[PDB]
Design a protein around this ligand. Structure first.
Ligand code: X90
Length: 161
């Protein structure tokens, strides 16, 4: 689905702290409740030396904010990782400048029109208008039906409460 990938991605340089400033999905149900399936809040990226990606994040489940750890495995495409879970879940890095913003989408492997969610990550708990502008331009193709964004207070709280 996603026709935008970052050329020349250096996965080591995305290490460190990130904030999920905005999210969007193809289906309202993927993001509507606090416990919605792709309502996830990125905490940090931890690239391994072989070039896989450990992801720390928070997710609300059963009435509280839970910390999760995910391994995205590398593929032959530098910008595309596989989540390793039951669903053939692919993560694509659309664009990043390493020091300010990273845009990524995650999609299901097939069925036929399928689930897709994308986030605008930023390095600091600040509304970055230019990064949100790149996020919205990246998505104006994609068939999104829900979009969320968060204010700096929420960005400093667990599960953006
Ligand atoms: C590649 C650099 C960008 C960072 C990508 C972050 C991708 C989160 C992927 C999370 C997928 C959904 C997790 C669902 C909760 C875990 C579970 O229920 O098993």
């Amino acid at each position: 689905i996603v026709t935008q990938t970052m050329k020349g991605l250096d996965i080591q340089k995305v290490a460190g702290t990130w904030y999920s400033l905005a999210m969007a999905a193809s289906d309202i149900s993927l993001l509507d409740a606090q416990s919605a399936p792709l309502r996830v809040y990125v905490e940090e990226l931890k690239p391994t030396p072989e070039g896989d990606l450990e992801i720390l994040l928070q997710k609300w489940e059963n009435g509280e904010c839970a910390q999760k750890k995910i391994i995205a495995e590398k593929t032959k495409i530098p910008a595309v990782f596989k989540i390793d879970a039951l669903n053939e879940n692919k993560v694509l890095v659309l664009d990043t400048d390493y020091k300010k913003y990273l845009l990524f989408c995650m999609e299901n492997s097939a069925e036929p029109e399928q689930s897709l969610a994308c986030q605008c990550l930023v390095r600091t708990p600040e509304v970055d208008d230019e990064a949100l502008e790149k996020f919205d331009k990246a998505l104006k193709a994609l068939p999104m039906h829900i979009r969320l964004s968060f204010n700096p207070t929420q960005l400093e709280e667990q599960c953006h409460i």
